[PDB]
Design a protein around this nucleic acid. Structure first.
Lengths: 104, 48, 48
RNA sequence: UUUUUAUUAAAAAAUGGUAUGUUUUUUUU
C-alpha cells in the first residue's frame, strides 16, 4: 500500500496493519611520438602555405609596380624560384629538427 | 458570492474542510484515524 | 495508500503467478537503479 | 550524507432449551 510495504487490506489477518520503520536499519603520455612528428610536419606545411600567401601578396605588389611603370591586371612574382627558396626552408627546418634531436 | 439559493439546514456541513485538508500534526492516534475514516467516506461518496 | 489518506480494498485481485514467468523484463539484471519509485510517482503520473 | 509519517475489530433474533393435545344441553310426541 505504500512504497511496497504493507498488506493490501488488514481484513483476513489478525493484525491491524500499521507498518513501522525499522528504526534499526543500518544506512551505510603518447607512445607513438610520430603523432607529434606528423603534427609538426603538417604545421610546417601550413607555414609553407602562409609563405605562399606572402608570395601572392608580393605578386600583387609586383603587379602594382608594373602598372605604375606602364603609367609612367594581376601578375605573379616568381613562378618556381619560390619553390627553391622553399627548398632552402626545408633545409633549415631539417637542420632545426636535427639540432632538436641532438638536444633531447 | 452575494447571491445564492438557500440550501437546507442539513445540507451545510460546516467542518468538511477540516478533514478534507491534511491532519494537524501531533494529534493522538484516534484523532488521525477519525480524520482518515471521514475522508474515506467522502471519497466513496464522490466516486459513486 | 497515500499515508494520510484512506485505504480501500484491492479492486483487482488478479495478480497470481498464472504466467509463472518473471518475463525477463522487470528483472534487476537489466535495470539502472537511481532512486526508488515511490507511490507518489505512481499516483502523480499513473500511466507512465 | 540530514528526518519523519502508515493503528482491522466491536451486537441482536432463532437454532437453544419450564414440548404438547384435550376440554360446559332451549322445546320432540
Amino acid at each position: 500500500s505504500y512504497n511496497g510495504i504493507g498488506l493490501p487490506t488488514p481484513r483476513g489477518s489478525g493484525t491491524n496493519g500499521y507498518v513501522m520503520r525499522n528504526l534499526s536499519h543500518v544506512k551505510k603520455v603518447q607512445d607513438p611520438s610520430i603523432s607529434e612528428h606528423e603534427c609538426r610536419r603538417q604545421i610546417e606545411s601550413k607555414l609553407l602555405l602562409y609563405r605562399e600567401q606572402l608570395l601572392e601578396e608580393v605578386s600583387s605588389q609586383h603587379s602594382t609596380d608594373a602598372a605604375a611603370s606602364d603609367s609612367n591586371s594581376k601578375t605573379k612574382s616568381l613562378d618556381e624560384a619560390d619553390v627553391e627558396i622553399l627548398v632552402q626552408k626545408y633545409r633549415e627546418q631539417l637542420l632545426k629538427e636535427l639540432q632538436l634531436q641532438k638536444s633531447t | 458570492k452575494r447571491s445564492g439559493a438557500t440550501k437546507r439546514a442539513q445540507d451545510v456541513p460546516l467542518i468538511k474542510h477540516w478533514y478534507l485538508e491534511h491532519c494537524p500534526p501531533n494529534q493522538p492516534v484516534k484523532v488521525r484515524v477519525s480524520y482518515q475514516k471521514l475522508l474515506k467516506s467522502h471519497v466513496m461518496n464522490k466516486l459513486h | 495508500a497515500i499515508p494520510g489518506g484512506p485505504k480501500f480494498e484491492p479492486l483487482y485481485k488478479d495478480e497470481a503467478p498464472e504466467m509463472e514467468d518473471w518475463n525477463e523484463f522487470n528483472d534487476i539484471y537489466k535495470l539502472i537503479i537511481r532512486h526508488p519509485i515511490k507511490t507518489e510517482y505512481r499516483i502523480a503520473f499513473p500511466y507512465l
